[model samples]
Target: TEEGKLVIWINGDKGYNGLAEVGKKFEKDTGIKVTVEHPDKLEEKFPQVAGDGPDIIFWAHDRFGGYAQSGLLAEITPAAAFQDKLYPFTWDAVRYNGKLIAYPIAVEALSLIYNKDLLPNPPKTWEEIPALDKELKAKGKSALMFNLQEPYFTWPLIAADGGYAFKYAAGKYDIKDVGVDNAGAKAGLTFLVDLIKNKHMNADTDYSIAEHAFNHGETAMTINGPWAWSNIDTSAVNYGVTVLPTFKGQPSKPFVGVLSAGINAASPNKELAKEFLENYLLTDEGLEAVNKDKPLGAVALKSYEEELVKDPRVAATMENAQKGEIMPNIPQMSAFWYAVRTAVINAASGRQTVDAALAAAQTNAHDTTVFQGVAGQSLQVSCPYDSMKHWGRRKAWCRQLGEKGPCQRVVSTHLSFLRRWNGSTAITDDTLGGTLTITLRNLQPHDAGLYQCQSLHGSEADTLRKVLVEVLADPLDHHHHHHHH
Candidate 1:
């Protein structure tokens, strides 16, 4: 049975607009009534949700733990097992204590955007970056740029050092076991501290000044994401992008977030909700819409590089995500944010040794029991639409349809299947004078739809070549083994 009318709530003006755009399509297709309310703050809806809430909630990862502990969420697993259709990190973020409670509807991450002319080759690690500061300063350039006050700027570095706000083990996360005290994590902070103290990057610079420095060619490097790619005046200079650099042995693990669609736990229409998510949210329609909103990297079942191969802004971050790790959704993540910040600042100020500051921060994280509030019945829905085409724009390579069209003959050649489970490749001597490699991962039921390839680049775009990814669960090998035989 379908859930009765569905209502969703979100925080901020953009929340309502995102909902309105996607909601209209959902309502039209399902005959399901939809209501969207935008609240400046999410807390206001908790009372209503806790008592008798809307079917679904639009929430952030930091709030998932409290909802789970309070028994406010309904299990999606055995139900949403198809949840594998989503990105691993995003999917895992919504699960609490081995139970999947929410669907991942979106994602956000920090990317390493650099000026191509600043350094011919990108720095592979956070420590490798300091030399850039020295080089640029000698050349009268700002070595690095960032917002000292904004957690967005600082967290990525901390994350790279193997530090986490919460510790996860055996499928459960404990907030009290903050890793700020871990040597690797503290080293990550110390690395940042050396930069600020040495004046390689100013502690007082805001995002604007930092961005302006890069644009005007004063700053050489800064840590951000695809969102920041659009913020740059590319007309002024040639810039390149990659995943955030690593620190010590750890890669720069930024706190990524997605504005994905989630189903309401209280609603009776969980099945329909799952189907809706699979088709609209996980399929090409929703993927295109979200990327249309901004180039902040949509977490589609398709590959990060393939979907954005045509988009200059997005193409830059392609290689970056290959090594990137997803942010965890454990609510205890909140406690570590402030505590890590304090340690970073104190270490940077020379007030204490890096080890000392981190140790103190780790000690302060004693409230392992402090679970963050879940955005019960929250609504942060809507695709990041890019149809207007201000920046990032992409489409499935195998979706084009028509006689003599890019995808017409191409589809017939691959046994004419819409999607392939595991991985498939397309070939064309026209491009590399031969075959092209198109790889995809984490396929799903919804991925079985029409796709077309843009046969434009001769080795550049590699048209006539395509790949399909279909998600399938291999049967469990519970059979007894007979080694003696």
Candidate 2:
């Protein structure tokens, strides 16, 4: 071993141009070569084997939810002096359950972008949009255009009065408290559908289509972020950016995401990675280098905003970013996206009523598993083992005893009958393309509660599946009552 290296994996093939200079500087000072690789499907194969994967992941902060929950990413606290210099929201973006899990690099968000020639003035509230739509239609134009069904662009509409992707409370995300079908969300979707029906908006326009329409003067306005600014700049469109119009007098907020990097918990160079992130990436010089190669409308730090390079857009985006909600990072967020797409499309196409579609969406966004057993009946608990099997880690099933009690382990491949739980628990590990299935006889009321199947990796357990058990009253008790009668 040359003893001079740190590994980083990024999802892009082009790589970060700014990192080249940053890496060179680090190498000069510390003699540590920061090798960056663009691997295909990096998310799926991350930390494939502890200590064998990349030392750091240069990716979006939204991608760290599951990794943070699973303890795959290390937790690090930035210096208080450095924290004071950065935007508060930037720190929140890299956090999971109030714990800082990554280094925030750049901030990104979308707002209303309108062509001044087509629309002299943007509407202040969406109520004004309908009145202006009449004028726009007379000129053979649409008032607004955006990716109709894309959850990213549509979230602001859903966030109307009380809508959200996930309900956050006490600095933590409650994955079970989905806001997709709430009253506010339904009203938001209804408003969007009304626009389409009245010819004020078009549901057919997707991301690129909307961008093309706005750039070519076909549509008066579209919603997008910094990435689309360069294309609009070259198209000879005199565009003015603004915050999204209020919907029914309520502020419509978009989702904000940050470009971030996290150190792998299993890495031997974690301390070095933390030092590099804190001292190098978040610094003014480090940010300037990145901004030079790849311009950004928003950055995590406030120290690099002295110049006017793309500051016009930055000025416009900062307003929306402040109003925007942080991206949802709970592991169950995947279910919401999958269900919302269908609900939006169905409601827009008139294939389903708004409430009906939302109701279906709410149902689809939750777990389908049902486990109920009568008292004294036998119950078989199972935990699948694909994510951990490849990593060669031990898998265990646990019954959560209580809020502060140790997770009562039923069984693991490494130990049999370890007595973490009751003696009646019996486990069988299926190593040949199968999972562990355990039998828990004599199911009592007290045995019912929360249970988890997880991987034992490092100090933190990686949850694979979770269940809330229910034990019903014994049917034999009713039989005895009928006999006595």
Candidate 3:
């Protein structure tokens, strides 16, 4: 039974279930026996299972340095020589001190997602979010959504708003680059705090609960990743995904999480074990398994690119991921993640000022190695901050950043409106004598209503263009089945 036989001990929660589908194919193609084991608590089990572990052991990257220090991971310099074919980030995470400790696999990140029924096209700028929320709220819906308790999901939004957990310097990334106290970071936090406190997010819920709210239409949007798509109840709703809203030309993206296969240092069948990994990750069969049978988006391999992209779920992920950075697997990153989480939660709950929280976070994260910015990516600058003075003051006015006067004035900025039937309204003021064509599509039984256009006479007022709404039938509950017809 020693014919290239290998036993592997793997650790993960529900997510590792997909690897079972992948393991089956590895056996068929390579004729190598692989036993994949999943123990409940990996950190707890590592001590007991380390020396007695199988030929190969799959584990989390968060523990990479621990294994290296404890002699749990063997030097994989030979594997590093073949790194050219792998994605840059995949190689970066497993490489420590110029040596590859593990083979790379999948990558992960969060993206701004929304209910297509509510937002076919999401706001492109940070300035537009408030109005977007207001529109959803006026219709008795939450415009955007988030879990105030989960820091990891929203961190990218903070970065897009020009914040960083640590400072960057030289070729090596370190925490000295922390920029949470920077002006752009503070400004970015303002919106995140406001949404939870004044706009629509629940102050007390977790991300899972908030996601459920989105599914039920209680909330229209949220930041999440590919793992969420399969769980979404699409039978009752339509949904869409978009790149994060830009803050000063910076797009928001989340820390990428990955699920990869690692060979065990103590495996008796090291060569055969390595061969299994090569076939499982570098070949199409293993990639396809993660593509569909698993909740993950893509494996590190590029051979399966077209098949993966053809799937709608995978395509949306690739779109947002193009702008993302792979999460750091370095041991120092652990300290930074916890500190950043604490600061972000404090700001989200308003318990701490955004500035103070960021400053504290930067200080704590820097105590470790110079914390690197995710994976070689830098945070963006601040978007123009708006004053409350101009909201609904007169006909809607839009201007460029730092403009002292209004650039253009429109009667109303609203693109859509609702009304009642048989309503007669007229405008006598001649500010600008012109009419715009209005078309009503998808007219249903409930859409029977009368609309009137009017002009107003006053400055600091709603523009001359106004509509009076009258509903012939109760638009809210128009199910009066006429028996005669």
lDDT of all the models against the reference?
0.56, 0.75, 0.57
Assess every candidate by TM-score.
Answer: 0.59, 0.70, 0.64
Of 2 and 3, the candidate ranking higher by TM-score: 2
Q: In lDDT terms, how accurate is model 3?
A: 0.57
Q: Pick the candidate with the highest lDDT.
A: 2
User: Deviation in angstroms for 389 in model 1?
Assistant: 44
Ten consecutive residues with minimal summed lDDT in candidate 3? 378-387
- Tens digit of per-residue lDDT, candidate 3, span 1-485: 13477666665432445666666667787676566676665544563466576565565455565465455666665454356556777666777767777776666566677888888887887667777777888888877776667566667777776666544555466545666667766777776777667645656777667777888887778777766765564436677766767776788756566655555566667677666677564667666565454356655666565566676666767666776565556655655666677777778777788787887766556432211112112211111111132332212221112212222321232322323342211112222323332323233333222222222224323221122212233244545667794
Indicate which candidate wins on TM-score: 2
Writing each residue's lDDT as its tens digit, candidate 1 over 329-411 gives 55444445555666666676676788887876785444321211112111111111112221221222454342222344333
Clashes of each: 39, 0, 25
Ranking by lDDT: 2, 3, 1
Candidate 1, run of 10 with poorest lDDT: 377-386
> RMSD to native for every prediction?
24.0, 8.3, 28.0
